[PDB]
């Protein structure tokens, strides 16, 4: 009769022990999977950090490429001014010769020598002018080329914007999940511990029941 | 005697429950974060792949910019060749002029006006030469700028490759935690449900005892 109610207690102890035994098993198996990424996770945080330097290096490189193109632009702007100076010299030479010829013809036979020479100085001037306009042509292609370069570089910066943003969001996410994990692990330990201690206190009490 | 054990059991059960009840409350709130974390994970994964395709575009664009710089190269060399041509013409004009002065010397004062013109035809020749030397100085600094930017673009090209790689690893690891979170959520979900069932039964049996005997 009294021994009858004893079997209930011992039974109840078996219920407690089985539960705590399973809570311990499950939480330890869970801690394991968590922990087995806490290595793979570190390489990643180290990788993002290094990735940031690369971003920074790229952002500057693009900046350098730009100011550099701006340089040849300045250089082209000068070749253009300088070539126009050659063009002017060519034209100043041209009328002196032309007018020299006119005067040459004014004089008799002697003029012929000069007249022949003046005639060639002219053709050489008109030939010079020609080379000038050809150089100007290549100057305008270099201008066109540069513009396309800069625009291509701005197309690079715009697209690289998202690359910077997404990596920052990665570091952020990473910090928060590490934290999430810690709280999980932390809640399983604290819980397992107090629950195991509880069943220990229950089992002891039960040992007393059967003991006497 | 049964009583001291009976009260001990109740008290312990009562506390036992409070702790189990507390685990459930914490478990639920973690499960709420996990679910909110799975979604965020889904977006960061989309952003990653968009960056992956963006980088691919830049990879192709830099190849283009190098072609543009290379074309300026062709042009600038084409200028130097034309500049030499002008220079030759200047030398030729100079002796033509020098020969004129020298032949205007030979023909009295009947031509001491062709001396004047011949003299500045010479002066303009030398002017052309000076100018041209500055065009070369300038034309070389462009090649110096061109090469320097072809090198900067090469280091850029490879720099975008390391970024493309890193992005591919990020995707790897993202897919890899999306998995980890899912497992943890599943693990809590079932552990909460069976803890509730098992503990409910031990709570019921305790009360059955507490009243009898």
């Amino acid at each position: 009769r009294i021994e009858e109610v004893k079997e209930r207690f011992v039974n109840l102890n078996r219920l407690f022990q089985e539960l705590v035994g399973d809570f311990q098993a499950k939480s330890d198996q869970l801690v394991s999977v968590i922990q087995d990424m806490e290595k793979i996770s570190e390489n990643i945080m180290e990788e993002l950090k290094k990735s940031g330097t690369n971003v920074d290096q790229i952002v500057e490189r693009v900046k350098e490429a730009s100011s550099q193109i701006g340089e040849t632009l300045e250089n082209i702007r000068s070749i253009e001014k300088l070539i126009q100076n050659i063009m002017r010299i060519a034209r100043e030479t041209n009328i002196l010769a032309l007018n020299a010829t006119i005067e040459a013809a004014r004089a008799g036979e002697a003029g012929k020598g000069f007249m022949i020479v003046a005639n060639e100085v002219q053709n050489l001037s008109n030939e010079t002018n020609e080379v000038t306009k050809q150089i100007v042509e290549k100057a305008r292609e270099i201008l066109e080329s540069s513009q396309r370069s800069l625009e291509n570089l701005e197309f690079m910066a715009n697209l690289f914007e998202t690359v910077g943003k997404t990596l920052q969001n990665m570091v952020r996410f990473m910090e928060n999940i590490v934290k999430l994990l810690q709280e999980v692990r932390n809640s399983l330990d604290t819980s397992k511990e107090s629950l195991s201690e509880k069943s220990a206190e229950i089992d002891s009490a039960t040992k007393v029941l059967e003991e006497t």
Side-chain angles (χ1 to χ4, degrees), chain A:
Chain A
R1 263 56 174 185
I2 282 299
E3 180 195 346
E4 196 85 22
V5 79
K6 275 179 68 283
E7 294 151 299
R8 277 287 209 73
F9 286 107
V10 169
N11 152 68
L12 201 55
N13 176 51
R14 187 199 59 75
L15 291 189
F16 273 108
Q17 305 311 317
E18 288 302 327
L19 177 47
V20 182
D22 275 297
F23 192 82
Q24 275 155 18
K26 96 84 182 191
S27 59
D28 286 358
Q29 141 221 278
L30 230 193
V31 175
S32 294
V33 192
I34 295 305
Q35 183 226 326
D36 99 47
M37 204 149 287
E38 171 179 17
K39 210 260 164 200
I40 321 186
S41 207
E42 85 85 9
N43 295 79
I44 295 304
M45 283 195 42
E46 208 161 277
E47 197 163 343
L48 271 328
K49 190 158 164 53
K50 282 208 59 180
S51 191
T53 304
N54 297 125
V55 175
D56 212 285
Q57 283 201 24
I58 298 171
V59 176
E60 291 219 305
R61 288 312 196 141
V62 183
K63 181 196 172 299
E64 249 69 52
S66 295
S67 69
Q68 287 165 201
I69 288 170
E71 293 180 27
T72 83
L73 240 20
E74 187 206 325
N75 285 326
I76 289 299
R77 199 238 265 247
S78 292
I79 287 173
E80 284 203 295
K81 301 210 298 84
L82 281 176
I83 201 208
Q84 293 189 65
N85 199 7
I86 285 168
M87 197 158 77
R88 280 180 270 114
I89 301 300
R91 198 97 73 254
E92 274 161 41
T93 298
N94 179 230
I95 47 181
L96 267 30
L98 187 53
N99 286 348
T101 295
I102 294 300
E103 281 302 305
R106 187 77 57 72
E109 55 193 27
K112 284 191 92 179
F114 208 83
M115 178 161 9
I116 291 295
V117 176
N119 183 74
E120 183 64 351
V121 168
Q122 289 201 59
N123 288 355
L124 263 46
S125 308
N126 186 257
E127 175 60 76
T128 294
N129 177 75
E130 179 256 35
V131 196
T132 295
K133 89 86 208 303
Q134 289 194 70
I135 287 177
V136 171
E137 197 198 282
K138 308 293 173 190
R140 302 192 100 219
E141 293 188 62
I142 295 169
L143 253 22
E144 203 136 71
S145 168
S146 294
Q147 292 304 133
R148 268 187 275 140
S149 289
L150 298 162
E151 293 282 355
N152 214 240
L153 296 176
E154 192 204 305
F155 169 91
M156 276 181 228
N158 288 178
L159 259 56
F160 204 54
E161 270 287 18
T162 321
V163 183
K165 277 304 295 157
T166 296
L167 292 173
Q168 292 174 40
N169 304 151
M170 265 298 280
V171 178
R172 242 110 66 175
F173 175 75
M174 271 322 287
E175 299 176 34
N176 287 303
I177 140 137
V178 163
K179 180 180 172 58
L180 168 76
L181 260 25
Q182 283 176 190
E183 295 175 0
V184 169
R185 272 203 61 185
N186 209 296
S187 180
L188 287 184
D189 282 349
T190 300
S191 272
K192 175 179 64 170
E193 263 59 281
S194 51
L195 249 51
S196 65
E197 169 186 351
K198 226 66 207 181
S199 85
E201 296 155 330
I202 287 270
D203 178 58
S204 71
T206 306
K207 287 177 176 178
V208 181
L209 210 202
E210 174 75 281
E211 209 157 49
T212 30

